[PDB]
Each structure stands twice: as C-alpha cells, then as structure tokens.
C-alpha cells in the first residue's frame, strides 16, 4: 500500500495518510481519512486536535494597510479523536493502541487545488497538534483536490461571426494535457477587404472572486500565419496549437495546478461545476477585425494509480 506519513519536530506527532490527492466526482468527494500517532506521554492534561482548512492566498506585501490579512479561509474543520473504514482500521493494527483515527469530509461547492506562479492560490492544509484547548510541535501537510476528464464528450464546439465571414469549429471539447488542438477555419471574404495575416491564439480565463468577480486575460499559445486571402476567394485550413509550459514561464499570475512543495506542475485544469478560482480555456481566432471565441475543456484523463507527489525526474 505504501501509506504516506509526515512527522513533527522533536518527534512528538506523526500522521499517516493513505493518499494525498482526492478526486471530486461531481457528486461526492473522497473522504480525508488517516491516523495520527502520538507520543505515549505527551498528552497529559491535553487533547489532540486535527484541523483541516482551505487557504486562499491572495497577496504578499511588506505591510498590512489597515486590517487586510492577505489570507482568507474558505472552510475550517476540526477533529478531536480523543465506523472506521478499511484503511485506517489496518493502520491501527500496524501502529498499536496509541493511534487515534481522524475522519474528514470535503463539502461541495469548494475550489480545487490551484496555484499561481510568481504560492498564491487555493490550497488544502492539514494541521495536527495537541494542546489544552507553535510550528515546532505541530504537523503541517498539504493535499490537493483535483478533478479529471468526465465520461461525456459534450457537444462539438462551433462559433461563427460576420462583419467578411469567419467560421471556426474545434473537433471536440475534452482535450488532454499536452494534446494538440485541431481547429478548422473557413472564410469567404465577400468583398472590399483583404486579410494580411491569420492569427489563432489560446488564452486562459481564470474566474477569481473574493469580494467581486474578476477576469484574467493571459494568452498561453499564440500562432501567426502569413497566408493572405483575396476578395471573392474561399480559404480553408486546419491549424495546430497546443498549450505548454515552455514559453509561458516568467508570466506572473499564470494559473497552474496545486504545488505541494516547490514542485513543477502543468497548467491548471478547467473547473467544471463559489468563492475561489475557476479556470476556463478559450481559443481566439482573429482576422487582420473579427474575433471568434471557442471555449474548450482541458482536463487530465482518469488515472489507474495515485499521481506522484513531485516530478518523476528529480534534479
């Protein structure tokens, strides 16, 4: 099974977790279960407390102006632990009688694990401590709530505009990470206009809300074509564009997947359904002007094993 554990300074507390990534199934969320191991005598006149909270970091400066704490909490849970599942019951037998299981549930309408590269974004954090209710007597863990590609392909994207006629339609909606996008553009160019270039770009829209709705216009991949269309001539061509985290570096605020500890993660997956960050992807085609937006969903496929906690090649 290879359960994952993290200890605390001075060897006082230790928590065992079956997995660190929880999948949202659009109808239920994987329970955050586990077992905490405590020193045999460290709890005299004290009670162990395990807390799971959601942190939405939204700023980092050198001074709070009046009261702005630069960190808002969306969900707070607390467990004391002084029916068991099939995972934590096995941990009790392996550890002994000094282990106390803790059970946590993630309510619906909660943001996924998203991180903004410069760790700003939504993060899930677990604190385990004992007190009669410091960072050297508590266990700090970070977990990710992620969603994968659904089983419904969805309707075929299509969007048309006229001002010159432009038609674009992607083959499908569900695109895997790293999968190139095949888009077909058809133009008529009725009269009295001549397009100098063909521009196809992919931009990432992130819906961040804490007090008001905000939108992001962060292009990911941009493609430029030198083809020119003369009046009363039809032109059909299929372009290939694919988002990738190679030329998008050094772009502050880019939406990325949840980072555990200074790891490398790809672009944030599209959020499918609240206070948090909602990520959406669109494809923009411009003629040089008329603009056509083709929304699409970019999600990971359903895996057969727990994803790694870091990049497989280290250093």
């Amino acid at each position: 099974t290879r359960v994952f554990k993290k200890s605390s300074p001075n060897g006082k507390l230790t928590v065992y977790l079956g997995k660190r990534d929880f999948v949202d199934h659009l109808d239920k969320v994987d329970p955050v279960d586990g077992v905490v191991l405590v020193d045999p005598d460290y709890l005299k006149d004290r009670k162990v407390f395990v807390t799971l909270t959601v942190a939405f970091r939204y700023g980092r400066e050198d001074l709070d102006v009046l009261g702005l704490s630069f960190r808002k909490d969306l969900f707070i849970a607390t467990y004391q632990a002084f029916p068991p599942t099939r995972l934590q019951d096995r941990l009790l037998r392996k550890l002994g009688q000094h282990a106390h299981p803790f059970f946590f549930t993630i309510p619906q309408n909660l943001p996924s694990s998203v991180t903004l590269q410069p760790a700003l974004g939504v993060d899930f954090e677990i604190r385990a401590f004992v007190a009669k209710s410091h960072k050297r007597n508590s266990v700090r863990l970070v977990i990710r709530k992620v969603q994968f590609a659904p089983e419904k392909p969805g309707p075929q994207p299509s969007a048309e505009t006229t001002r010159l006629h432009l038609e674009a339609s992607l083959d499908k909606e569900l695109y895997y990470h790293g999968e190139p996008l095949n888009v077909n553009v058809h133009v008529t160019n009725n009269s009295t206009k001549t397009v100098k270039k063909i521009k196809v770009s992919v931009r990432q829209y992130a819906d961040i809300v804490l007090f008001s709705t905000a939108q992001y216009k962060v292009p990911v991949a941009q493609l430029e074509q030198d083809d020119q269309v003369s009046p009363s001539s039809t032109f059909s061509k299929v372009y290939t564009i694919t988002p990738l985290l190679s030329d998008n570096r050094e772009k502050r605020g880019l939406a990325l997947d949840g980072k555990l500890k200074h790891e490398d993660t790809n672009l944030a997956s599209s959020t499918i359904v609240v206070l948090g960050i909602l990520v959406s992807y669109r494809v923009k085609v411009k003629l040089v002007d008329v603009s056509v937006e083709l929304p699409f969903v970019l999600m990971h496929p359903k895996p057969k094993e727990e994803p790694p906690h870091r990049e497989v090649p280290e250093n």
Partner: single-chain antibody
Amino acid sequence: IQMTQSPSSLSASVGDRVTITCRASQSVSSAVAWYQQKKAPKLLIYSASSLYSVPSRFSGSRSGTDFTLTISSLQPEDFATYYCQQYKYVPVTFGQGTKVVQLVESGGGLVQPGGSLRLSCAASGFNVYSSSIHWVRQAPGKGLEWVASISSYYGYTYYADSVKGRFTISADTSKNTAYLQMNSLRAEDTAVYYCARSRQFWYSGLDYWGQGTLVTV
C-alpha cells in the same frame, strides 16, 4: 544509485519458477520498471505492483529496498535478459542482465573520432508535447545506460554525468521528430542507441522502444 542483482545467469526447465531480485542503494520509492530484452527491450512491470497492458504470469513485489520479479510459470518464449530500473531521479540507472505505434531511427556507420554523426528519431502515433523522448546506450556485453532525455512540455534537457557537454538533445515539435547531436566522440561511446518513448506527465516507464542503430568507433 548503484543497482546490482543477485542472480547472474540461471537455468530452468519449462515448469520451473524463475525468481529475479533487484536491490537498490538509496531506499528508492515504489518506482521500478522491469524490461525484458531478447531486439528492443519490452516493459513488463511498472511501479513494481502494476501490470503493463504481457500475460498475467509476470508479478512484481516490493519488500523495501529489495524488489523481486516472479514468473511462477516459465514459457519457452522467455529466454531473455531482465533489467531493473528506478525512475526516481534524473540519472536513472539500469540493473544487470539475468540470462535464463512504432519508432524508427536512422544513422550509423564508422565514427572516425571527430565529427557529428547526427541521429534522428521518427514518431508515428503520438506527439512530443505529451510524451517524453529518452535515449539510452547499450555497449556489447553490457547493460543499458541512459544518456539523454528531452521534455518538450517543460523544455528540460537532462544529460548523464559522463555524457553531458559532448551531447545535445533537440526536438522539432513540428514533424514529431527527435534528434541527438553528438560531438567529441571517444572510443568508449561505441554502443547501440535505442530511442525510447514515455508519457510525459505520468512517467510510468519507457513503453515503446526503437529498433536501435549500431554505432561503432
């Protein structure tokens, strides 16, 4: 990470049970890929617990720093060499042999030390943005040796400690072709190069291997 295997060259009948043991040296996690090479090597077990989409006879078990491969039913089409690999750090190390969608590459011939000898790898059935390309070396009478790797999604260029500087990996990212620029070739680099493919995000192991090109100095 130095990796040695206790068996060296065993013999068994049709109905015997061949057991292969793999031992690490730095307490590697549950990330071990087993390859069978008669031809290009074929991946059998990845993550030491999962079965590649090969028969069910092959089984993998983890006992800490020691990894064991159990056949439990031998077949006449099993005479090959098995290697043990750990995909936890960039300098991936292959084990020692235990005798008991296609990729096409071009290039070869006499080296005549001093030159380029530009090799190329052709991909048909997959892209480069979602799959990494790995190059390995196999000297005659010796195990596999990873020398280079490319990740087009992240732009990372990984080279071996004894191969960096004299080698250069590149990706076209348009025609789905990968190339390896080699310079200052020495007499110790005479080995067969195998173009390898692996899924970029979930590096489960080198799934499909190339036909291999002979490079002699």
